[PDB]
Structure formats: C-alpha cells, structure tokens
C-alpha cells in the first residue's frame, strides 16, 4: 500500500473496474534480497526511477474477478494494466500468477474486486532493469577516431 501511494499506481486500483490484485505480502518484498532478483530490482530504489516502478506494480493488477474457485484446473492468460500478458494457472489447488505461488486464497473487496496474497514479486516479462547512473564519457581526442574509421580504400582491400 505504501508503494502504491508513492508511485501513483494506487489511483488506478482505486477504480471501480473488477480487478484481481495479486498484492504480495511484505515477506515477499522482504524476499527481494535474492542475489539474483536484487540485480534487476535494486535499481528501482533510486528516487528517479519511479518510471519502471509503476510498470512493475501495474503487472499485479488483472482486469476481471478471477477467484480461486474459478480456476478449477484451468490455465488462462491475460495481460495486466501494465500491458503485457500474464498466465494465471490453477491446478491441484495451486493457483499461480507468473511466479506468484499464491498464499491466501481471496479477499473480497469493494467493487467486486479480489485480492490474492502472493509469495514473491512478479516482474514483467520484457522488463529490462534500468542501468545505474553513469558518467557521460567523451572521446578523448579526435585523431584516435578518424584512425578508428575505415577509409573507402580500406573497404575494397586496397590497403591493409
């Protein structure tokens, strides 16, 4: 709820459309200290990268009211309000949302919306982590680069 309030995504899931939120408990957020997952998600801790934070939180909102009872051995996909598809897979009473492994079944909400508690944070499929802030580097000199470009007489094999 705090990330929603800061990131401005919370206005979106205020709306009356029937949503199926997969809100991760903070043990899931506390479980973001993977050596692996910290690579692709730590860069969002920077205060300018609210841009991807909406795009990663908006992957947890599903248009429609998918209760766990509605997932009796059914595998149906859908895209989020982020814009990319997510596969909800309920088999053997183990309902999955990407890499969710849902903990608590459903929570009935106001506008016919449902809330499922997940064990991890779903990263969108074609999400690349933002690079760290770097140094704008400038070519040191100009004769090391004319010497870096192949002349036309080189391209025809006239020269070495």
């Amino acid at each position: 709820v705090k990330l929603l309030n800061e990131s401005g995504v919370e206005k979106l899931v205020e709306q009356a459309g029937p949503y199926t939120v997969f809100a991760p408990t903070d043990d899931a957020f506390a479980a973001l200290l993977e050596p692996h997952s910290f690579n692709k998600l730590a860069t969002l801790l920077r205060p300018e990268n609210n841009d991807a934070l909406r795009k990663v939180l908006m992957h947890h909102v599903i248009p429609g009211a998918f209760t766990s009872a509605s997932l009796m051995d059914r595998a149906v996909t859908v895209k989020s309000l982020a814009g990319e598809p997510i596969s909800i897979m309920g088999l053997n009473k183990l309902v999955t949302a990407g890499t969710a492994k849902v903990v608590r079944a459903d929570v009935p909400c106001a506008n016919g919306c449902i809330i499922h508690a997940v064990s991890s944070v779903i990263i969108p499929p074609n999400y690349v982590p933002v690079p760290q802030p770097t140094k704008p580097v400038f070519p040191r000199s100009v004769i090391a680069e004319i010497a870096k470009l192949p002349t036309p007489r080189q391209a025809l094999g006239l020269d070495p």
Partner: protein, 161 residues
C-alpha cells in the same frame, strides 16, 4: 449547515447555556468581518467564469490530463471539469459568507473522494486546480479577503485528499 452565528447558537444550545459572554467573541468579529465577506462574495460572483478559466489554464491544462488518454480528454469530460470546478468556487463562496465550513462537508466533501476513485478522477490534479483557483481568488478579493476565501479552499483540498 451552520454559519458562524448558528454555530454559536448551536453549540451553546446543546448544553442549554445562554451565551457565555466570551462566546460572542467570534460573533463579535464575525459582524466586524461581515462587510468584508459580502464584497468578497460580490466580485467572485462577477468573475466566476473568469476565475475558473484562469485556474485551469494555469494548473491543470499544462500536462496530459488534457491530451488523449489523460483524465480530461473528451469534451464531455472537459466540460464536466469546469462544471465541477464551479462548485468548488461556488461552495467556497458560501463558506466565506457563512463563516463556517460545515456546508462544504455537508454538501461537497462527503462521498467526494470516494466518488472520484470510482470514476478514476485524479485527486492530485484536482487539488492543484483548486490551489490555482485559490491563487487567483486572492487576486480579486484582496489579501485578507483572499485569506478568508482561501481558508475554505484548502479545507476542500484537505478533505478531498
């Protein structure tokens, strides 16, 4: 729906008191500022359309929430705004005359933030519009009258938040 005078009767009735002489404190200004509030409500009635045209051009219309996809794109949706901003500038005028913001939450604030979340209206841009509308209202009515009319604008912005 109580004014400054109602409020004192109304508070002072419920403990059946008569007025406890201090009680009139507020009342005794209130009548002192009675001349200021009418002239403040006078010019605001005259420049109602001009104030709302100044606020939206200074705040809100300078970021999407005018372009396609933004919350204010279609002409029905744009026309709902100036209809919607008219109530804030109008009901704030009522609070400025009555000297008590009871009319705002009675007729504006209750079910308001719960309604914008239903429609998906951005509360952030709404308050900015009222803040800009508060800024132009201090232009017309002056400093202290703007302090009075401005005192009910942020009351709307606070509860609407």
């Amino acid at each position: 729906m109580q004014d400054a005078i109602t409020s004192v009767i109304n508070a002072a009735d419920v403990q059946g008191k008569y007025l406890d002489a201090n009680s009139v404190e507020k009342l005794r200004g209130y009548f002192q500022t009675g001349e200021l509030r009418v002239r403040a409500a006078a010019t605001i009635a005259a420049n109602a359309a001009t104030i709302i045209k100044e606020a939206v051009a200074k705040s809100l219309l300078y970021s999407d929430i005018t372009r396609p996809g933004g919350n204010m794109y279609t002409t029905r949706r744009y026309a709902a705004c100036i209809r919607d901003l008219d109530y804030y500038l109008r009901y704030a005028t009522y609070g400025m005359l009555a000297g008590d913001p009871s009319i705002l939450d009675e007729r504006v604030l209750n079910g308001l933030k719960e309604t914008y979340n239903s429609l998906g209206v951005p509360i952030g841009a709404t308050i900015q519009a009222i803040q800009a509308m508060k800024e132009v209202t201090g232009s017309l009515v002056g400093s202290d009258a703007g302090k009075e009319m401005g005192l009910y604008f942020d009351y709307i912005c606070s509860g609407l938040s």
